[PDB]
């Protein structure tokens, strides 16, 4: 319905010894609580990540954008994780080397026009090296405010 819901509790720092699935369940958790996705959303993102990985080997901060099928989404939402230390995602391009991910953009979008808008915003944002480093030092409020400003465009 064109809007993207992004709330202050959709931004979190994660503990160190978290696996890939741990991350995915933790980022999907506030989306589930808010009723923005089906209740077993994490399972679908996990299963999708295994066959179609979402790691982007960009420098200096590795990124992933895990997601699943739009038919599991109820309202557009985005969920953001900051990793204490890298966790490998497989490379979205089919390179053998894993991606040491520090920043995770979980996407729960059901509108095609919002999907493409967000993907394009992410490609731009991850090439802003100052901004990507900032994400590793800012707290949750500064991350939310920072992303909110840049996303609000549409």
């Amino acid at each position, epitope marked *: *319905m*064109q809007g993207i819901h992004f709330r202050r509790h959709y931004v979190r720092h994660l503990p160190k010894e978290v696996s890939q699935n741990d991350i995915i369940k933790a980022l999907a958790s506030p989306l589930i609580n808010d009723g923005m996705v089906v209740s077993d959303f994490a399972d679908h993102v996990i299963t999708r990540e295994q066959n179609f990985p979402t790691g982007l080997p960009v420098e200096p901060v590795g990124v992933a954008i895990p997601h699943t099928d739009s038919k599991y989404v109820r309202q557009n939402a985005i969920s953001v994780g900051i990793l204490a230390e890298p966790v490998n995602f497989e490379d979205a391009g089919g390179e053998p080397d894993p991606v040491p991910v520090r920043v995770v953009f979980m996407l729960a979008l*059901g*509108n*095609w*026009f919002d999907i*493409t*808008n967000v993907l*394009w915003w992410i*490609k731009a944002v991850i090439q802003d090296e100052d901004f990507m480093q900032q994400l590793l030092v800012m707290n949750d409020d500064e991350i939310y405010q920072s992303i909110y400003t840049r996303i609000s465009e549409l």
Partner: antibody
Amino acid sequence: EVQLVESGGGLVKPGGSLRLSCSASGFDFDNAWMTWVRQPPGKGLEWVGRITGPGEGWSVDYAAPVEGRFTISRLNSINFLYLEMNNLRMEDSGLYFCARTGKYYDFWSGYPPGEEYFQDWGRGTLVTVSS
Amino acid sequence: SYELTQETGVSVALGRTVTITCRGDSLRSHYASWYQKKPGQAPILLFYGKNNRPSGVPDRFSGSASGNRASLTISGAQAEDDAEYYCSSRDKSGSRLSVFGGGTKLTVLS
């Protein structure tokens, strides 16, 4: 074997109205984006308009010469797509096609809102607008 | 051929290779998709995006893209390839509308 079957075309006077139908089978219609396309006599394909899916609140977009006059709707319970045409003009004459519509966006090189392509097509229904 | 411009007509000897082109400013931002059509028959999706070919489409059909140009190469034209070919894309960079090229009549000297 996807099946698309258009009907309703016929002779109309300029200023008149006409309602096209598109029967659809063999795929997930309720989630399919659907496009109407037309070929005026002896000319090429012309994009008419397109209706999206549930994730997009079933929004519709129209070709410039056709906005306001044409209406694209759907009833998913019977897998039917419709095109409502009012205040018809000579140059509205043509073979009208319905088409199951896919969506494409390449992450690294793409630009919003990506592109739409037409993977399945019906055989058409003929519209003649004339005095 | 309004926003998207195609050659009116091109011919190619049977067996030989021919590239047909599609030009417009929106192609600087958007990929084109390609369609074959013959009189009396429904169109057929040949190619779309960066490098996608539907199954059942012969591999002699290949699309590519550069600058404001999209192109469809037919490598070793058969008789049944004698047809009209249409390109399609956004009418404008960033647009939700779509548009077709005016079409190219390809004659295969068979």
